[PDB]
Amino acid sequence: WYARATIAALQAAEYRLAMPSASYTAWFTDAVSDKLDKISESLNTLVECVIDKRLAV
Amino acid sequence: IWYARATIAALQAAEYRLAMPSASYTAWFTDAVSDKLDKISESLNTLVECVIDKRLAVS
Amino acid sequence: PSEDYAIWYARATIAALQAAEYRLAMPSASYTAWFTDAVSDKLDKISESLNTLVECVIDKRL
Amino acid sequence: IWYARATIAALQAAEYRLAMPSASYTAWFTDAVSDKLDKISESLNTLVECVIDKRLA
Amino acid sequence: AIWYARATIAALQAAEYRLAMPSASYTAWFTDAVSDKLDKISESLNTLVECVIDKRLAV
């Protein structure tokens, strides 16, 4: 009965995420955020090169 | 005693439905993902409008 | 309940919670709607901008 | 009796290690994220193709 | 039974949940789902940048 009522309780509820641990954010940074930084930098380089091709004498 | 073994069992058997995250998580997530996507999107708009229209993309 | 019960419960519950792993269900509608605004819609705009770029680059080779 | 107060404190004292998500989650996440990454990736590679092809010709 | 469901669910929804380092099982899935595609996108973008710069700097 306990295993069932607990599972029923766990699946009935909703879960609000707090701030993640320092360990999670370190993992997420390498998995996602650092890559986004590099993609932003690469893209801004490309934009600036294209703009400079339009503006250069 | 037995309360630890059956509880782990219940926890692993269950599935967990995320609610809206806390203001704290969302503010972290906005910095780690959403704000960067905005800058990337705005940069690609700039690229496109310069290449296509020879004008500056504006927000 | 006694303090000794309280301590056992806290230690047993925390140990069980950290021993287990958590399989995510379909998120609630509030989460998926938030995530769509936070992430998915921005990826769509990025994707659409690239499609316009590709279309124009390919076309100029007319 | 004293259960929900002690339970809340335990739930918030622990940290949570995510497992492989359910099939419903991954099916959802694929539509919400990964399918769009694939489309973005495909469009970038087409752009690389064109710029390379012009270089070779 | 009624009370247990009631107070346990009340507690679960009142608490907030701090993510640990995810399991290797989750990161393996998330790598396929996200991080590998981010890698590929970055590599293509970098190739595009380098070739547009290469043509600018050529001869």
Side-chain angles (χ1 to χ4, degrees):
Chain A
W1 168 90
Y2 177 77
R4 270 308 160 88
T6 309
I7 293 164
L10 288 165
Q11 304 198 136
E14 279 182 341
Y15 297 83
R16 185 170 54 267
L17 297 175
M19 172 83 187
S21 65
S23 177
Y24 181 90
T25 67
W27 168 78
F28 190 85
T29 287
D30 301 312
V32 174
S33 290
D34 290 345
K35 304 186 194 297
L36 299 185
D37 292 339
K38 295 299 184 186
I39 287 153
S40 170
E41 292 162 21
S42 189
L43 177 55
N44 294 357
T45 307
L46 174 61
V47 172
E48 289 161 30
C49 182
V50 173
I51 290 174
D52 189 48
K53 284 191 288 169
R54 169 59 176 163
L55 300 181
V57 292
Chain B
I1 49 181
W2 171 90
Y3 174 90
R5 199 156 54 215
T7 302
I8 296 172
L11 288 165
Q12 312 243 73
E15 287 178 9
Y16 300 85
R17 182 182 333 278
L18 294 168
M20 174 77 196
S22 64
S24 191
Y25 179 96
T26 60
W28 168 78
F29 190 87
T30 299
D31 287 331
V33 177
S34 303
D35 291 335
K36 306 180 183 318
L37 297 179
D38 286 330
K39 292 306 175 66
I40 287 169
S41 171
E42 169 188 358
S43 183
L44 185 59
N45 288 332
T46 305
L47 177 55
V48 169
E49 305 297 345
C50 181
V51 166
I52 303 322
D53 284 4
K54 305 266 228 312
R55 65 181 191 94
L56 183 73
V58 279
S59 298
Chain C
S2 68
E3 170 89 335
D4 316 71
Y5 187 80
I7 297 177
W8 160 84
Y9 181 75
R11 294 177 62 199
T13 310
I14 296 166
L17 289 165
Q18 291 185 153
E21 286 174 3
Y22 296 85
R23 179 172 205 87
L24 288 174
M26 175 86 71
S28 74
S30 289
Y31 182 96
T32 53
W34 165 77
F35 192 90
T36 292
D37 300 337
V39 176
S40 299
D41 282 352
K42 305 187 195 293
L43 300 177
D44 286 335
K45 266 287 144 62
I46 289 164
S47 189
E48 196 197 320
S49 285
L50 273 169
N51 296 341
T52 307
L53 250 196
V54 169
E55 276 170 354
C56 166
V57 175
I58 291 183
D59 275 359
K60 188 188 176 181
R61 198 175 52 81
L62 217 63
Chain D
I1 287 296
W2 151 90
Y3 169 77
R5 185 164 185 67
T7 309
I8 290 168
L11 291 162
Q12 299 195 153
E15 304 191 343
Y16 296 77
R17 169 175 72 264
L18 284 175
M20 174 84 199
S22 66
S24 284
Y25 185 89
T26 59
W28 166 79
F29 192 87
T30 292
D31 298 348
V33 172
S34 305
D35 284 346
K36 313 177 181 296
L37 295 186
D38 289 328
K39 188 62 201 194
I40 290 165
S41 191
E42 188 193 353
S43 289
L44 269 172
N45 176 83
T46 300
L47 293 176
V48 170
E49 278 174 337
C50 285
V51 171
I52 297 299
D53 285 352
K54 183 140 59 144
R55 197 173 176 279
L56 299 158
Chain E
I2 164 67
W3 160 89
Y4 177 70
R6 191 218 283 156
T8 303
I9 292 166
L12 294 161
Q13 302 194 139
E16 299 187 359
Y17 298 80
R18 200 170 165 97
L19 286 173
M21 166 97 196
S23 73
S25 178
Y26 178 89
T27 60
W29 168 82
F30 189 86
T31 291
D32 295 356
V34 173
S35 312
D36 292 346
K37 310 178 183 299
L38 293 184
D39 291 328
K40 184 46 205 287
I41 287 167
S42 170
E43 195 272 355
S44 294
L45 188 48
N46 287 352
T47 304
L48 185 54
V49 169
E50 296 279 24
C51 293
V52 172
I53 278 164
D54 182 80
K55 180 182 165 181
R56 195 69 193 180
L57 297 181
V59 313

